[PDB]
Amino acid sequence: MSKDLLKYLSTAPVLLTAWMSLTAGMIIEIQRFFPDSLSF
Template sequence: MYYNKEGGFSMQDIKTYLSTAPVLTTLWFGSLAGLLIEINRLFPDALSFPFF
């Protein structure tokens, strides 16, 4: 990890952090949970989805 002369992190460090597996997994499962919550809010107690 390299520091800029201002003392911050470089853009490459931020891109490397955001492309790591735990961050991507958290974003994936968070968006999946949000999608499932919204589907259940719009179609409550649906055992099948006949529109597929």
């Protein structure tokens, strides 16, 4: 790491890609553990 590499990792596209990857992973793992849910 560095004081300026973390600033690059703090940019909008890198953070957007990382957060969308985390959200997609969380939803995919929820679908893996709790599949085919229509009602609550």
